[PDB]
Swiss-Prot record, chain A:
It comes from Homo sapiens (Human). The lineage of its organism: Eukaryota, Metazoa, Chordata, Craniata, Vertebrata. The gene is DDB2. Pathway: Protein modification; protein ubiquitination. GO terms for molecular function: damaged DNA binding; DNA binding; protein-containing complex binding. Its main location: nucleus. Component of the UV-DDB complex which includes DDB1 and DDB2. The UV-DDB complex interacts with monoubiquitinated histone H2A and binds to XPC via the DDB2 subunit. Component of the DCX (DDB1-CUL4-X-box) E3 ubiquitin-protein ligase complex DDB1-CUL4-ROC1 (also known as CUL4-DDB-ROC1 and CUL4-DDB-RBX1), which includes CUL4A or CUL4B, DDB1, DDB2 and RBX1. DDB2 may function as the substrate recognition module within this complex. The DDB1-CUL4-ROC1 complex may associate with the COP9 signalosome, and this inhibits the E3 ubiquitin-protein ligase activity of the complex. A motif (DWD box) lies at residues 196-214. WD repeats lie at residues 56-91, 99-134, 143-178, 184-227, 230-269, 283-326, 336-360. This is DNA damage-binding protein 2.
Swiss-Prot record, chain B:
Its main location: cytoplasm. Belongs to the DDB1 family. This is DNA damage-binding protein 1. PANTHER family: DNA REPAIR/RNA PROCESSING CPSF FAMILY (PTHR10644). Component of the UV-DDB complex which includes DDB1 and DDB2; the heterodimer dimerizes to give rise to a heterotetramer when bound to damaged DNA. The UV-DDB complex interacts with monoubiquitinated histone H2A and binds to XPC via the DDB2 subunit. Component of numerous DCX (DDB1-CUL4-X-box) E3 ubiquitin-protein ligase complexes which consist of a core of DDB1, CUL4A or CUL4B and RBX1. DDB1 may recruit specific substrate targeting subunits to the DCX complex. (Microbial infection) Interacts with Simian virus 5 protein V. Pathway: Protein modification; protein ubiquitination. Protein, which is both involved in DNA repair and protein ubiquitination, as part of the UV-DDB complex and DCX (DDB1-CUL4-X-box) complexes, respectively. Core component of the UV-DDB complex (UV-damaged DNA-binding protein complex), a complex that recognizes UV-induced DNA damage and recruit proteins of the nucleotide excision repair pathway (the NER pathway) to initiate DNA repair. The UV-DDB complex preferentially binds to cyclobutane pyrimidine dimers (CPD), 6-4 photoproducts (6-4 PP), apurinic sites and short mismatches. There is a cross-link at residue 806 (Glycyl lysine isopeptide (Lys-Gly) (interchain with G-Cter in SUMO2)). It is linked to White-Kernohan syndrome: An autosomal dominant disorder characterized by global developmental delay, variably impaired intellectual development, hypotonia, and characteristic facial features. Some patients may have genitourinary and skeletal abnormalities. The gene is DDB1. It comes from the Eukaryota. Keywords: Acetylation, Biological rhythms, Cytoplasm, Disease variant, DNA damage, DNA repair, DNA-binding, Host-virus interaction, Intellectual disability, Isopeptide bond, Nucleus, Phosphoprotein, Repeat, Ubl conjugation, Ubl conjugation pathway. Residues 13-356 are annotated as: WD repeat beta-propeller A. The modification N-acetylserine is found at residue 2. It comes from Homo sapiens.
Length: 363, 825
């Protein structure tokens, strides 16, 4: 809540009206105002429970309040706010078809791509009707773990529990399925700014940057960053220059454009691994250099702050140090996930059997 | 369905950069001046400047430096744009035809990178071996200057130092060498690197790093015989060269930051330094001889020469004459005399060049004649601050010096005066409060008033103040519309900033009031928590406070709304009624904002511009007495200005110098879909719009109709450019875009920049081609190409003259069309 220097709010706004001050300096002081009001998100708005634990999350891009969410048994929900029309639901097998990756269809917002334990990378309607499968294991005990899609490139990609990665187009056209890592692929994501270099994360304590179009030669990769422990996720910026990374033990790493190999600053943090808990995935603000993560306290962690509680913290990217913290009794579980709107006005969080809404105060 | 037309009414007037050299011929001394998109070329004469050539570029000129590779008979020019278009240009004259030839061009943008805080820096080695660019933190881009590098191919070098303040190439080095100031947790430091082309990497520099002043801010590369580097800070100036170290801390420079420098003598023996108060100093380098024939720096001295306009840039020309390029005030030519005048100044102004920028507010008034609008702008900053009165017939401009910063303007016809909000800087006195640095409008009024409300500050806590704190003092000025005399000044409270201003009638009350919205500003607050709306009546030469309303925030914006007053206060929009007892009473509030900075209205509809929640459409409901949220633009945009084009079309401008237009989603089948505004128009303007306002300067031809465009919205910008936005029919839009594509095939772009790329909507989040906007400047450019080129432009073009069937277009048809379009401004 309490912060480093700032002042001169309308001065800065006016000095931008003068051309005196630079937009980054401007943008810096408005990051602060979000941090200020984010200390006034302290009242929680909404909850929405259902059956088996959550495993993924995704916003409607155009819409702030509409969100898609999935279960530990492959059960999707599509919840919007200010509607009161009892949101959509699709059920699944319930036991062994756990959804693990989920991103909207950029073309048809009432469609969506889904990655499950069944081994069926699919595109499906909120009314249940499957439009198309995209890939398959064609053999049990083999399924998909990671998934993402592009639209400027119109490119689909998914990971596996073995370490080989698959890349599709919006209409099939499979030219991929080489191997990239030796163990399960935790997370995967593409650049929004450029279109044709990939990153990928796996259990192998390594994250790998690829150039999907140039490389076809079985680890004829571009870069590869080692890590002390396995990694849950690694997410580019919206800016694309600042690649973020989360370990499994306790760390966050900040890999920028400039010489991907070496890092910038280490944000140690407890978000510890566990079997029945959903894996933790930090995330970016779409429009600031902020980072938001959920805390999983561990007595073994060398805590800088002496009070250790499960909560959501708010970091600055290019600095390294925290800026705000979100706590709420009657929410004393652990949020594995957290996902601001692309809007950036609102925040959703996913706890086991509980989804949470974190908007501002009603003055 | 929204088609718009954008045109320049006044080109940008602020000067962003200026350099001299021998560009037009080896024998000529040229002056080149950058005004955003414009490059002006002059020849320097004994009396002044002879204009030789003026070009527009499809880009904001960001870097401009002359250089001369071997085998060139005169200097070449490197330009880099804000969109990272790099080019090498050559001046070519033959007869009366002057052309700028593009020797090399290419885009040096990276796929990723965060733009640096101190912006793009570009430097060229004195021997023209290479260009160096500081585009992003942590990276140094090198463009080798090989004859074959017509595509300007480049490579990056890692920089360990992430926060570079300034950098230059050094003179007298057998290998290219940079010297730069950077910031880290340990403070500020100065360091050097050699640049290895073989390795495409830095090598160890010839001399070790030094710590510099905490606010060390500029690097000067000193030529031979001195060599080395000068580092300019806020309190000190130091010179470094190998084992040589010399620092001075002249108290004279501490009062105001030096922000620009220029070499006076080719050998580096003298430099000018200019500060934020317009003071001009000479910096003198004393030589010491050595037995081996080398020269070392013996001493440094600073001497106050006098005062200029606050300089963005300075260029010594010749014969004691200086060009002072200003972005905050008028540019100047001044003469430097060896001996001072009665007041102790060596500076005498020779010539002044109008600068309208920054244009912070404006209004249109028919001051003299019906239907003949004139623009009255709030222009300038600090001692250059002024009003500017602009009228056609190209334009006549009257300047009203205020000697302080104007912020807002309104016109009050019934009192035949303007109200203007202004602020001035004062500093602590010897024993009391604060004192002004010069006389100004707020201290020279015919009569003056002060506030006396004691409700402005609650639970005030005394805070220790360090010596020399400057303070902003805000005032409402009442200014005669004819004489522009300062009729009255009302001083606001301590720490109170006046942000918004309206002149209006309210309710059933026949009086007209000046209404001001303020904020109480404290340094430790992330956002203001306190403010007032104050209603004044102007009569008998003075302002009387009629009413006040306390709010817990900054009153960013106010607009008269159906005889009530709508105001924005931090994240709220509030509607006040004016009571019979002359008070403001809240009728209704809207809360779903981050920070409501900008308001405009039409009828019962309200367009709200947010800090970051770009545009919102509200409706006031007269049978419900409240607001209804109609729709929002769900695309994020950091707004700088907004305007209502009509009930269905909403104009926005954002911080990345783009315009967009929003419309209701016509293909919406649900309330939820109806709530999404669609950005149906997009345009990279390349200017920062401070104000939109309805009106026109061109004489209105009553019953003119069956014209190409409908409506007229003027806008003013930071650079002092004034533009116009108007609406188009579908057929006119289609005609002009076909014309655009054909024109784009014919017009030679300086630096071979594509118009579509330049005008393509571009932010750090997204880049998209322009839509729904015609570039009127480009349209007008049809009139300046040769006739065979005009005939080429209109070749195989189907055209409907007046009302009828389409036929082949002739040059005269499009000449007529374009001539009609040029007269709308």
């Amino acid at each position: 809540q309490i912060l480093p220097p700032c002042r001169s709010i309308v001065r800065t706004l006016h000095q931008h009206k003068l051309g005196r001050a630079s937009w980054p300096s401007v943008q810096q002081g408005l990051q602060q105002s979000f941090l200020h009001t984010l200390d006034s998100y302290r009242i929680l708005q909404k909850a929405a429970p259902f059956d088996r634990r959550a495993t993924s999350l995704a916003w409607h891009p155009t819409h702030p309040s509409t969100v898609a969410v999935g279960s530990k048994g492959g059960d999707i929900m599509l919840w919007n706010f200010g509607i009161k029309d009892k949101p959509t639901f699709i059920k699944g097998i319930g036991a062994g078809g756990s959804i693990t990756g989920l991103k909207f269809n950029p073309l048809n917002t009432n469609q969506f791509y889904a990655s499950s334990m069944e081994g069926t990378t699919r595109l499906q309607d909120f009314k249940g009707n499957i439009l198309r499968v995209f890939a398959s294991s064609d053999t049990i005990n083999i399924w998909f773990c990671s998934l993402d899609v592009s639209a400027s490139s119109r490119m689909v990609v998914t990971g596996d529990n073995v370490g080989n990665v698959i890349l599709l187009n919006m209409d099939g056209k499979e030219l991929w399925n080489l191997r990239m890592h030796k163990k399960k692929v935790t997370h995967v994501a593409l650049n929004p700014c450029c279109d044709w270099f990939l990153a990928t994360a796996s259990v192998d304590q390594t994250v790998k940057i690829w150039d999907l179009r140039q490389v076809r030669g079985k680890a004829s990769f571009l870069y590869s960053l080692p890590h002390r422990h396995p990694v849950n996720a690694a997410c580019f910026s919206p800016d694309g220059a600042r690649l973020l990374t989360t370990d499994q033990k306790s760390e966050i790493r900040v890999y920028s454009a400039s010489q991907w190999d070496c890092p910038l600053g280490l944000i140690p943090h407890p978000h510890r691994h566990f079997q029945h808990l959903t894996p933790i995935k930090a995330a970016w603000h779409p429009r600031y250099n902020l980072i938001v993560v959920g805390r999983y306290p561990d007595p073994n962690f060398k805590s800088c702050t002496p009070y250790e509680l499960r909560t959501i913290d708010v970091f600055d990217g290019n600095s390294g140090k925290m800026m705000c913290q979100l706590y709420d009794p009657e929410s004393s579980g652990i949020s594995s996930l957290n996902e601001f709107n692309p809007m950036g006005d609102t925040l959703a969080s996913a706890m086991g059997y509980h989804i949470l809404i974190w908007s501002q105060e009603e003055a | 369905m929204s088609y718009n037309y954008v045109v320049t009414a006044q080109k940008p007037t602020a000067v962003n950069g200026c350099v001299t050299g021998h560009f037009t011929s080896a024998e000529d001394l040229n002056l080149l001046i950058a005004k955003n998109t414009r490059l002006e070329i002059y020849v320097v004469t004994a009396e002044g400047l002879r204009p030789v050539k003026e070009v527009g570029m499809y880009g904001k000129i960001a870097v401009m430096e002359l250089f001369r590779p071997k085998g060139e008979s005169k200097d070449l020019l490197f330009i880099l744009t804000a969109k990272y278009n790099a080019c090498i240009l050559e001046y070519k004259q033959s007869g009366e035809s002057i052309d700028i030839i593009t020797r090399a061009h290419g885009n040096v943008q990276d796929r990723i990178g965060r733009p640096s805080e101190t912006g793009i820096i570009g430097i060229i080695d004195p021997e023209c071996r290479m260009i160096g660019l500081r585009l992003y933190d942590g990276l140094f881009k090198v463009i080798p200057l090989d004859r074959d590098n017509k595509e300007l191919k480049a490579f990056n070098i890692r920089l360990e130092e992430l926060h570079v303040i300034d950098v230059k190439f050094l003179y007298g080095c057998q290998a290219p060498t940079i010297c730069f100031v950077y910031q880290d947790p340990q403070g500020r430091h100065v360091k050097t690197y050699e640049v290895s082309l073989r390795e495409k990497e830095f090598n160890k520099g010839p001399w070790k790093q030094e710590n510099v002043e905490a606010e060390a801010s500029m690097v000067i590369a000193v030529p031979e015989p001195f060599g080395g580097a000068i580092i300019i800070g806020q309190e000190s100036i130091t010179y470094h060269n190998g084992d040589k170290y010399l620092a001075i801390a002249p108290p004279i420079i501490k009062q105001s930051t030096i922000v620009c420098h220029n070499r006076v003598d080719p050998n580096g023996s003298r430099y000018l330094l200019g500060d934020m108060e317009g003071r001009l100093f000479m910096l003198l380098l004393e030589k010491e001889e050595q037995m081996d024939g080398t020269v070392t720096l013996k001493d440094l001295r600073v001497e106050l020469l006098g005062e200029t306009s606050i300089a963005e840039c300075l260029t010594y020309l010749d014969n004691g004459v200086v060009f002072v390029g200003s972005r905050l005030g008028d540019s100047q030519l001044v003469k430097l005399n060896v001996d001072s005048n009665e007041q102790g100044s060596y500076v005498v102004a020779m010539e002044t060049f109008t600068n309208l920028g920054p244009i912070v507010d404006m209004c249109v008034v028919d001051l003299e004649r019906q239907g003949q609008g004139q623009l009255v702008t709030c222009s300038g900053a600090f001692k250059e601050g002024s009003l500017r009165i602009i009228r056609n017939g190209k334009l006549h401009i009257r300047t009203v010096p205020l000697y302080e910063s104007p912020r807002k303007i309104c016109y009050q016809e019934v009192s035949q005066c303007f109200g203007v909000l202004s602020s001035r800087i004062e500093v602590q006195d010897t024993s009391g409060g604060t004192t002004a640095l010069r006389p100004s409008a707020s201290t020279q009024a015919l009569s003056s008033s002060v506030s006396s409300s004691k409700l402005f500050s609650s639970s005030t806590a005394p805070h220790e103040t360090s010596f020399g704190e400057e303070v902003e003092v805000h005032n409402l000025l009442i200014i005669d519309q004819h004489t522009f005399e300062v009729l009255h000044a009302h001083q606001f409270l301590q720490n109170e900033y006046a942000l918004s201003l309206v002149s209006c009638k309210l309710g059933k009350d026949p009086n007209t009031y000046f209404i001001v919205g303020t904020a109480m500003v404290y340094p430790e607050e992330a956002e203001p928590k306190q403010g007032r709306i104050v209603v004044f009546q102007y009569s008998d030469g003075k302002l009387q406070t009629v009413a006040e309303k306390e709010v817990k925030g900054a009153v960013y914006s106010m607009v008269e709304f159906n005889g009530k007053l709508l105001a924005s206060i931090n994240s709220t929009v509030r509607l006040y009624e004016w009571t019979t007892e002359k008070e403001l009473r809240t009728e209704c509030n809207h809360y779903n904002n981050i920070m409501a900075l900008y308001l405009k209205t039409k009828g019962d509809f309200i367009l709200v511009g947010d800090l970051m929640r770009s545009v919102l459409l509200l409706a006031y409901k007269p049978m419900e007495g409240n607001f209804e949220e109609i729709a929002r633009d769900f695309n994020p945009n950091w707004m700088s200005a907004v305007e209502i084009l009509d009930d269905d079309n909403f104009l926005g401008a954002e911080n990345a110098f783009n315009l967009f237009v929003c419309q209701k989603d016509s293909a919406a089948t649900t309330d939820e879909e109806r709530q999404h505004l669609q950005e149906v128009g997009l345009f990279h303007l390349g200017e920062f719009v401070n104000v939109f306002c309805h009106g026109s300067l061109v004489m209105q031809n009553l019953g003119e109709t069956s014209t190409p465009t409908q409506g007229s919205v003027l806008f003013g910008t930071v650079n002092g450019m004034i533009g116009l936005v108007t609406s188009l029919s579908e057929s006119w839009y289609n005609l002009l875009l076909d014309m655009q594509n054909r024109l784009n095939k014919v017009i030679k772009s300086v630096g071979k920049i594509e118009h579509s790329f330049w005008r393509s909507f571009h932010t750090e989040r997204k880049t998209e081609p322009a839509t729904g906007f015609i570039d009127g400047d480009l349209i007008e450019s049809f009139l300046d190409i040769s006739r065979p080129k005009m005939q080429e432009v209109v070749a195989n073009l189907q055209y409907d003259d007046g009302s009828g069937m389409k036929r082949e277009a002739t040059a005269d048809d499009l000449i007529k069309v374009v001539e009609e379009l040029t007269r709308i401004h």
